[model samples]
Target chain A: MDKNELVQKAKLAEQAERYDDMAACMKSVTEQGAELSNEERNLLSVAYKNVVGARRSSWRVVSSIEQKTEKKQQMAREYREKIETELRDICNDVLSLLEKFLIPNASQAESKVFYLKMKGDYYRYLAEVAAGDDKKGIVDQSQQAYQEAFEISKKEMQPTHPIRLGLALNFSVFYYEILNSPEKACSLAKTAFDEAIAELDEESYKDSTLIMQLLRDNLTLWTS
Target chain B: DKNELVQKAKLAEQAERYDDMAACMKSVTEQGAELSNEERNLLSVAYKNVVGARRSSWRVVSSIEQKTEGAEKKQQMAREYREKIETELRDICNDVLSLLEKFLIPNASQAESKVFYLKMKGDYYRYLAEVAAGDDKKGIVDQSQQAYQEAFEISKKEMQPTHPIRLGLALNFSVFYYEILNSPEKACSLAKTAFDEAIAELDTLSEESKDSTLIMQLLRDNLTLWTS
Candidate 1:
């Protein structure tokens, strides 16, 4: 299929929540040397995020396996390393796309924040399984990307905007879970949630309200 | 520290972060503190969600392996991937069963909690049955049957028919009969009995009857499908 046709199919698959097919379509579009529209970039991001999400979950389980003997532990480690390899590849592929095509070409502030948040997300995925200096490096990159996006979001978007709220939610999660800073996490989440709630209309902005709920949930957890 | 981990596990579950939930629960279990029924339930749920994805991926890959008849290389790759998934599934099943037997069941204070843990034990054995072969499969299936049967007996004596755990036990036990044992008649009979008993008690069901009512519907639905 042509690039437009493929993009259309990707949109359809995304609507249907068939992320593998969505990723397939977008990958084909990129292979044909076509630039993704903002919508297409978001679709691609969603697809890879879900596709990598499963691998991340699997890696966590595998890596946490406890074995009784050295031989079994070695075998478990090998299995976990295989999952980590696949996880790293998917994260790297999406990161490469964001750096090369999506982030630079994003004109709107919402689109820019969205792509940068996704960049941070994929880097965080890599950091999840990385070790030693490699993990530190990936964690630094993820924080920087998230911080840049947060600054842009604060300046450009309303606190009640879904993208802005979502960026805050994930950035705070990074602090709490990855950086191991509960205080920083609670402060960020609380500030965003309070600011949004002050202006949030319950009748409208369903997406924003949903993200605000997550932010508050995190705050409650972190503070406790 | 155990309480803190359990609380974190609860939040992780709420966030759909099953891996983190599993980690927290595992830590709590390792500390050798007696887990409450709620904590044990949370632990089961965490591991269930963690293994659920692997089970799904295994089914998909197994189906692909079945279809790739003539493509040798494709078949090899599919087989290898399927094996990897099976390994993970097996490991999880083993871990959960050990936890259930060693701590959850042994430490359960209430009859309802005992039935719950036994039912979970049966469910994990059924999972192991899904990937076993020949004699191994038969052994796992037998174990699953024994656990379900024990749970069913306790539920019959201790729990009201309309209790969610009792109804859920019926649902899964009937499923085990149909799917693992290949006993359509037994499955239909078991489901029909559960549905009939629950229907008789429908009027007396209390405020927490939603889950029981839902399972009754599922049992009735399965009976219809099996009988049809």
Candidate 2:
């Protein structure tokens, strides 16, 4: 396909979240000796990261007695060892790819923050598999990466930059859910909510409104 | 492909694009992949949107009919829309039954899904009754009543008396009995039991909080209707 056509298809594939197609399309572009713009490269990075690191099976299991649960248990029984081994391998694969783009002190702050966020994300996948001290250890690492990314982006990026807002939201949820510290959760959530509101007009952005509503819900429940 | 369609359908529904939601689902079934339980449930939702759109249109015509009384053109238009709604609903209900047998019922492991399926089953029979001409409507209406009873029994077994599922089922069934079957006593009995149970369960909730739940508010509204 021509470059423009391929880019159009890549956009559709990304919109549909067909990461396999998106990755293949990008691979074809490079394989044909065509150069991708910075935005296209970022898209390819996202496709690879999602394909390797994302879990589609984390849907809320409604009433654990579903037949899918039986299928999952059977698969676990048969390939339990491999399933346990594979997630860590996936994390390793993702982390290495990210590290290449994330040369310390050399890359732009946005690029640095992007790779670091992915680093934190992959560790979350790692923490899902590791147990006891190992799980806690990986989560601690993830939290540190997120905190570091947030600090850097806050200084380097605009106040309303989505990446910075995203990290702040993630860190707040981590405090509330994992660390079991509602005090810190409420503090961070309040700040994020206040800042997000200030960034938008009275007719707020959709994501900003959604975040504020969720923060409002959690804040009310926690305070009560 | 199914995931993409389901997500698109969800976005369409959120946007109130009922036509788009149906179109997305049509494409899903057109490609003809093996329908999973989730897909089957979603297909039911797709048809529901189609029928809902038809019913909403029918309501507008009915309001015009009330204003015009026996005006010829308006009456004819109303009758045509009613017939169209019936045909569309019948197709939807039949497809829901067929899909239930093929995919949902056998594989459904959750009581929640099964209850929802039964509720749809009840609704389909009610729709059929609405469309069926002559004495045949009696048997179809009875079947609808029986389906609602089955759903109600299952809801009672699977959930607390005042759980939202039970409350919703009770509310709808009460309305069906009163409005469709012309049995005010039966409606009052069902609604009163659910209304009292809801108040008891939600007693600890603040008054505003209790009313904040739409289902609870619906229960109170029904109670007012039945008592007054």
Candidate 3:
């Protein structure tokens, strides 16, 4: 399909909330070697994020089941493995797209930061189900991606900008949830929330304030 | 030791560590001692949080299925994924219901606790109705309605209008009326009555007023939305 045709279909898919279709359409456009607009990049990210999100949720449910018997344990393990394999594939696909297409082609700082944050997110998803040295390696990669996004966002975006604040929020979550570093998570979240509140125009930048509230809520929980 | 476990479970719930809360509650249940009202609430909350994500995923997949057409492979995969979520949801709902039926309701020392367990029973059945089909859905919906009605009758006789459990039961029973039974007028009237009665007693409410007031707000909100 032509790039315009595929992008148009992706837009329709988004309106219909069909992320699988959206992913398929955007994937076709990417495979056609066409550079995606920022809008298309967002649609692609949202698409795969949702697609992978369902698998991750299922994996958590399956993995958390109490496998009282050996037979039950094996069955649960197999189910969880199937979900993890699908999660890994989808995450890897989106990561490859970010590295090869989305990041290199993004012209705006906002787009760059967004793509990098997503890269960090997918890596963190991988780290969630990984084990042994593989888990450690994925965690390191996730941290690196988040740090890079943080640096770029700090330089190019306002403290109260939604993208920057969102990056801060997810990065801190990665620290607390994945890296098991409550201290780092609280420090990061507090800094972001405190800095943003100073410049926050709540009526004008509603999204920013919303994320700020989340950051503060997380800080309160972590500190408690 | 059970008290310590329940305390730890409460802390885990506060920390949003639902898996840990579930583990603690599991330990409490395995001890063979009857659970208190608070313990039962904690156990339900823990299981609800654990299963909530899967239910959400199931809803998402079901919506996706509605949008999807043709591609037999994709349709089949979506169906399978939804079934997996339904299995997990059903298991959790059954587990909670069995606990309520077998132990919690029977051992309840107070009318308040009995109403609470019955409300929970209705809630879990409502969840099952969400994913059920045809005759099965109708059967589950009827059970949900029966449980909610039983709780409503008991709460009306035994509890105050401003009581949290009473107000919560009214709110959820109205919800079951609207969503599960497809009786919008019945839902609205029930909610409106509950909200009105609670608001009249608002001035006399004490320390637990916040919980009752919050649910009354939901009842009022639902009334407004349903009427509009």
Top DockQ model: 3
Per-prediction fnat: 0.00, 0.00, 0.00
- Two-way lDDT contest, 2 vs 3, winner: 3
Q: For candidate 1, what TM-score does chain B get against the true chain B?
A: 0.95
Candidate 3 CAPRI level: incorrect
Clashing pairs in 1: none
- Which model is ahead, 1 or 2, in terms of DockQ? 1
**What lDDT tens digits, residue by residue, belong to model 2 across residues B15-46?**
34455566777667556554555665566677
Assess the local accuracy of residue A108 in candidate 2 as a C-alpha lDDT between 0 and 100: 72
Runs of candidate 1 with Cα error greater than 4 angstroms are A1-48, A51-224
* Residues A1-224 of candidate 1: C-alpha lDDT, one tens digit per residue: 67766776565455445577678889777666545666777677778878898777766655666332354465457656766887888888888877877777777888889989998998988888889879899999999999999999999988888888999999998998899999999889999989997983544598988998888878777665
Over the stretch A1-224, how does candidate 3's per-residue lDDT look in tens digits?
A: 57876776666556546577789889888777656776777778778877888788767766776243354466557657866897899999988888887888878888888988998999999999999879889999999989999999999988998899999999999999999999999999999988887873544588888999999889888886
> Tens-digit lDDT track for model 3 on B1-228?
786677657655654557668888977876766777678878988988877866777777788777789867556656766786689789888877887777777877788888988898899999999989787888898888888888899999998899999999988898888988889998988999888888888776887457887888888889888887
All candidates: TM-score = 0.58, 0.43, 0.56
Candidate 2 fnat reads 0.00
Query: How many pairs collide in each candidate, listed in order?
Result: 0, 0, 0
State the TM-score for model 1: 0.58
| Candidate 2 C-alpha error for residue B101, in Å | 3.9
| Residue-by-residue lDDT tens digits, candidate 1, B121-219 | 999999999899787888899999999999999999998888999999999999999999999999989898888898898777888457887888899
Residue pairs in candidate 3 whose N, alpha carbon or C atoms collide under 3 angstroms: none
- Candidate 3 residue A10 C-alpha distance from true site, Å: 17
